[PDB]
Design a protein around this motif. Sequence first.
Motif, short mmCIF file in Angstrom:
data_model
loop_
_atom_site.label_atom_id
_atom_site.label_comp_id
_atom_site.label_asym_id
_atom_site.label_seq_id
_atom_site.Cartn_x
_atom_site.Cartn_y
_atom_site.Cartn_z
N UNK A 1 0.84 -1.19 0.00
CA UNK A 1 0.00 0.00 0.00
C UNK A 1 0.88 1.24 0.00
N UNK A 2 2.13 1.04 -0.38
CA UNK A 2 3.04 2.16 -0.54
C UNK A 2 3.69 2.09 -1.92
N UNK A 3 3.60 3.20 -2.66
CA UNK A 3 4.15 3.32 -4.01
C UNK A 3 5.55 3.97 -3.97
N UNK A 4 6.61 3.15 -4.02
CA UNK A 4 7.93 3.78 -4.15
C UNK A 4 8.07 4.48 -5.52
N UNK A 5 8.73 5.62 -5.53
CA UNK A 5 8.97 6.35 -6.77
C UNK A 5 10.46 6.61 -6.93
N UNK A 6 10.95 6.56 -8.18
CA UNK A 6 12.37 6.80 -8.45
C UNK A 6 12.70 8.25 -8.81
N UNK A 7 13.47 8.90 -7.95
CA UNK A 7 13.89 10.27 -8.19
C UNK A 7 15.13 10.27 -9.04
N UNK A 8 15.15 11.12 -10.05
CA UNK A 8 16.32 11.23 -10.91
C UNK A 8 17.54 11.69 -10.11
N UNK A 9 18.68 11.09 -10.39
CA UNK A 9 19.96 11.54 -9.84
C UNK A 9 20.11 13.06 -9.98
N UNK A 10 20.38 13.75 -8.88
CA UNK A 10 20.64 15.18 -8.95
C UNK A 10 19.45 16.10 -8.70
N UNK A 11 18.29 15.50 -8.43
CA UNK A 11 17.14 16.23 -7.93
C UNK A 11 16.54 17.21 -8.91
N UNK A 12 15.87 18.23 -8.37
CA UNK A 12 15.04 19.15 -9.16
C UNK A 12 15.81 19.87 -10.25
N UNK A 13 17.13 19.93 -10.09
CA UNK A 13 18.00 20.56 -11.07
C UNK A 13 17.99 19.80 -12.38
N UNK A 14 17.71 18.50 -12.31
CA UNK A 14 17.70 17.65 -13.50
C UNK A 14 16.29 17.28 -13.96
N UNK A 15 15.35 17.25 -13.02
CA UNK A 15 13.93 17.01 -13.32
C UNK A 15 13.07 17.71 -12.28
N UNK A 16 12.32 18.74 -12.70
CA UNK A 16 11.54 19.57 -11.77
C UNK A 16 10.22 18.92 -11.26
N UNK A 17 10.28 17.66 -10.84
CA UNK A 17 9.11 16.97 -10.33
C UNK A 17 8.99 16.95 -8.81
N UNK A 18 7.79 16.67 -8.33
CA UNK A 18 7.54 16.61 -6.90
C UNK A 18 8.36 15.49 -6.29
N UNK A 19 8.49 14.36 -7.01
CA UNK A 19 9.35 13.27 -6.56
C UNK A 19 10.72 13.81 -6.18
N UNK A 20 11.32 14.55 -7.10
CA UNK A 20 12.69 15.02 -6.94
C UNK A 20 12.80 16.00 -5.78
N UNK A 21 11.79 16.86 -5.64
CA UNK A 21 11.73 17.81 -4.52
C UNK A 21 11.70 17.11 -3.16
N UNK A 22 10.98 15.99 -3.09
CA UNK A 22 10.87 15.19 -1.84
C UNK A 22 12.19 14.57 -1.37
N UNK A 23 12.91 13.94 -2.29
CA UNK A 23 14.24 13.43 -2.00
C UNK A 23 15.22 14.58 -1.69
#
Lengths: 325, 320
Positions: free
Chosen positions: A118-140
């Motif tokens: 009941x938990x959805x792991x998500x993969x954040x792109x290496x290097x965070x929001x600088x490389x992909x401006x998604x909420x996933x990346x912001x969280x990591x």
Amino acid sequence: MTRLDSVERAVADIAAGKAVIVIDDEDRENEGDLIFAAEKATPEMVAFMVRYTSGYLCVPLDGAICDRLGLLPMYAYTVTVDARNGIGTGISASDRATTMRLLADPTSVADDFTRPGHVVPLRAKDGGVLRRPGHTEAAVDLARMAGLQPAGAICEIVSQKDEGSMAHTDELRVFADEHGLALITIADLIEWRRKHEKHIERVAEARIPTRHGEFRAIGYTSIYEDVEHVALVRGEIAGDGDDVLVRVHSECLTGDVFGSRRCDCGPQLDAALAMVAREGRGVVLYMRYGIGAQILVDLGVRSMRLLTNNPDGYGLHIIERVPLP
Amino acid sequence: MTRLDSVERAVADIAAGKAVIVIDDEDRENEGDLIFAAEKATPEMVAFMVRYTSGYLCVPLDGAICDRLGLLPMYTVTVDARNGIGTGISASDRATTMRLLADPTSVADDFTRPGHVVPLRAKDGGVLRRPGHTEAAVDLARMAGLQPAGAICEIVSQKDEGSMAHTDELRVFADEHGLALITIADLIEWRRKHEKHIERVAEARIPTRHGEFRAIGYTSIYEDVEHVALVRGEIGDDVLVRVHSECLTGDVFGSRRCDCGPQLDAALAMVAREGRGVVLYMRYGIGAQILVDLGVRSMRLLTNNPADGYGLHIIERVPL
Ligand SMILES: [Zn+2]
Ligand SMILES: [Zn+2]
């Protein structure tokens, strides 16, 4: 119109195990994710998250964590997980909290979890929001920036004024006010990281003889681009650092290289070099926003005067804008 | 001369599970790799290779398989299949390691370092970006419609045994065993005449110190840099060509430990003194590709340096 909390707040709240709200930018139509650090998941907090969100809880994770656990490998249904041990049915805020904590903890291994859950792991792109401006990346990013594990926990906030929909920007503002949470934008997060992390490093250093004398040529690379920028340095900069004459010159091929007559770029670099060389001390940056700002602070420039014909949070002091001949 | 087979034959041979022999060009002095498709590795086939080559078996790979397995990011790296093989050296075993590198569903944990197979990373774009025997191998594999993973090893000379076989013998060897002998030059030409590989990004009329040039931005589909071509007059025989390497220090800042700056200038001027010519600013694989696109068949080359498979013929060599 819209007012945002600072990134400095968000990091500190994250560090304290509190939650924040993240929208992409200032646009009024944005949905918002409620976000906390996975290793700070308690029953109280998850229950709070489940109360005001869609209940489709996600766990943004760093690639390194994913690979340790055999999850979302770099190379259709949603992958879900539940902690294998220590929980009941895996749906209550406690169980979900345990699962999140477990994903975050650096010791845990593949078989500490059962698929599905009941938990959805998500993969954040290496290097965070600088490389992909998604909420996933912001969280990591937020997790990591707070000195915690690069593991976050996110879910989108439902609207209360319009039952059917997800909350947009204005309502997230009062929600954040009412509940004492920070509201921040990925935009503000990106540029905070740009102003407070060193993304440059020196690659090469040579002294070059020119018509205008010798210049110390330092080469710089960006961890987030494949290009060497070069700074040409005359005389001693630091000890001092103040009152430095600077030119920031963005690369112009036709101009600088081929001596194009339909742009003054070429003539201008040459004039900048001349001027700097006459003053016997300065910096002409050859650039190919200001990553150039970080180079200057790396060069020990505290206060400068820019060479330019057209009239920041870096600790750089602009004193006087001055013309090129 | 020396008979060569067609690329068209070489590709069909690869697809069939057969091997080919590959050299650079028609030159008598050349050494040759024996090549088949990695996925088509059998005990029979590997055994044939071990028999006639140096036994230093290599598996050229598409950069995507390399990353996917975590080999050779950007001591000699070797590898062996984790399961289903004995000690590793045998043809059977080695065939298995080849087959398993070629498979899309195999993972890093399917392999053991060290091993008995040298995996090589081919440059992106194959022979159009690097005329190597390693690139030749994936290209054929891909052109055959199979996984972009090949296997190669050089052919030892039977006539002069301390040595590796040269062109003459390689043709004899191919005849002996009914294999196709082809050149990288002939491979390049097949490809460039068959595939999209180069684009024009922009055009403009650059007004330089030595008159007016027609500036044209070329890009490769395998790299994202944009080279500029400066063309004077109409281009297509006997054209004065200068291929100039970017030198930031010298071209831009006028360094004097360098001499590159006054070189680019001299080229532009010399091309201008004539009504006709091309000055390439590269930021020569891609170089050649651009020249043929401009419509150059023959050229006088501006260089201070002696010693292909594209269209070009070097008529003469001019200095300064
Ligand atoms: Zn310009
Ligand atoms: Zn040079």
